[PDB]
């Protein structure tokens, strides 16, 4: 009989089932528990300002071969240290 | 432990119609089954049917004709306002121009067209087409 | 190994199919006949075909062979092919005029049929 209860007065079982089973999609668990505001150096923000500590050459993953020219950046509102990529050939010279 | 005698009946009818048989025996019987079959009979989806009187609950022998594709059952028998017959008919009928949803009203068991005409609503039972 | 191939066997089969009232059992005259009769492009093929025709003729003379038919075997078949004996096995005069049915068969006859000669036996396990 399809497992779930079909009875006209089973709405409690149905909704409590949903409540317990929504904790298996990543988006719901993220939203509810709060991982942006706890983890995630951008505290649920789109952007963040930071101060450049260092320039870095990250060697790419296989099967490619290159050095990607990132920077170690300290964020202002958290103090978290973070690697960030500088695109667009050059521009590691335009940062300092 | 049967729970819906109507469900058992209509599963039997649907299965025999699939199998190509021209008759089915269904037990037990009930007023609801008789009225549902009377509706199907009125709209031509089945032939005559005969109620055997054992002293227990009843048997029915239905003579069917092949015009039926599916007879079905909506369990639980939800409560239906007149605004919602449209939604039910669209969901569980093949087309707008034929097929009948069966529902139980204070005026009686009947099809949704008759329910529109009598301007009443009620509880949904099944569908025929 | 000395297995003959399908070109040889098929050509021999055809030559037997349509030149059976010729084709002595001797390889030599069969060979000269193959020359007379078929546009074979090589002596070696001609001789192989002649040898296989001779083999088939031999095992024809000592009995029929499957696959082949040369119109003489066929007209001999349809000569036989119809045996209408002096009296059938379905007359009862070969028997004693009656038909030795059982009880249920007699009941069947009583149900559907009409007057019919018979006599009953009650065979069992």
């Amino acid at each position: 009989g399809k497992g779930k209860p079909r009875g006209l007065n089973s709405a409690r079982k149905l909704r409590v089932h949903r409540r317990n089973n929504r904790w298996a999609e990543n988006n719901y668990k993220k939203r509810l528990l709060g991982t942006a505001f706890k983890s995630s150096p951008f505290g649920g923000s789109s952007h963040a300002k930071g101060i450049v500590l260092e320039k870095l050459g990250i060697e790419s993953k296989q099967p490619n071969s290159a050095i990607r020219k990132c920077v170690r950046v300290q964020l202002i509102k958290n103090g978290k240290k973070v690697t960030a990529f500088v695109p667009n050939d050059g521009c590691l010279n335009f940062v300092d | 432990t049967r729970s819906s005698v109507l469900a058992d009946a209509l599963n039997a009818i649907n299965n025999a119609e699939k199998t190509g048989k021209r008759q089915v025996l269904i037990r037990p019987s009930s007023k609801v089954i008789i009225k549902f079959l009377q509706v199907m009979q009125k709209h031509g989806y089945i032939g005559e049917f005969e109620y055997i009187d054992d002293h227990r609950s009843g048997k029915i022998v239905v003579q069917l004709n092949g015009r039926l594709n599916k007879c079905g059952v909506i369990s639980p028998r939800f409560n239906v306002k007149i605004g919602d017959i449209e939604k039910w008919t669209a969901n569980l009928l093949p087309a707008r121009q034929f097929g009948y949803v069966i529902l139980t009203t204070s005026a009686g068991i009947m099809d949704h067209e008759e329910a529109r005409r009598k301007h009443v609503s009620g509880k949904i039972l099944g569908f025929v087409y | 190994g000395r297995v003959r191939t399908k070109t040889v066997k098929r050509a021999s089969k055809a030559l037997i199919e349509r030149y059976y009232p010729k084709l002595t059992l001797d390889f030599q005259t069969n060979k000269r006949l193959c020359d007379e009769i078929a546009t074979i492009q090589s002596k070696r093929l001609r001789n192989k075909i002649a040898g296989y025709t001779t083999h088939l003729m031999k095992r024809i003379q000592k009995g029929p062979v499957r696959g082949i038919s040369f119109k003489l075997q066929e007209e001999e078949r349809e000569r036989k092919d119809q045996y209408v004996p002096e009296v059938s096995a379905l007359d009862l005069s070969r028997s004693n005029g009656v038909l030795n049915v059982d009880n249920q068969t007699s009941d069947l006859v009583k149900s559907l049929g009409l007057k019919l000669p018979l006599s009953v036996i009650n065979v069992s396990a």
Partner: protein, 81 residues
């Protein structure tokens, strides 16, 4: 098959069925009027009796129980009524 009269089956096809699986169920059992050689009174005896039924006049054995039909005793007069 694919067409048949389920209301008017044959008695042959209906007698071999289970008692409950017939069109209308009912017992395959019956009652007997029984007299022993001694007396000439009739005793009503059920075919599936479950008891060692006695003849009230001559306190003797008439039927002994079994798994189904009762086994009537040595040669006696028994009807089906």
């Amino acid at each position: 098959v694919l067409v048949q009269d389920l209301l008017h089956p044959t008695a042959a096809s209906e007698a071999r069925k289970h008692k409950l699986k017939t069109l209308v169920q009912g017992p395959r059992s019956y009652f007997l009027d029984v007299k022993c050689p001694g007396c000439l009174n009739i005793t009503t005896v059920f075919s599936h009796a479950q008891t060692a039924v006695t003849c009230e006049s001559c306190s003797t054995i008439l039927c002994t129980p079994t798994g189904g039909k009762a086994k009537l005793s040595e040669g006696t007069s028994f009807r089906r009524k």
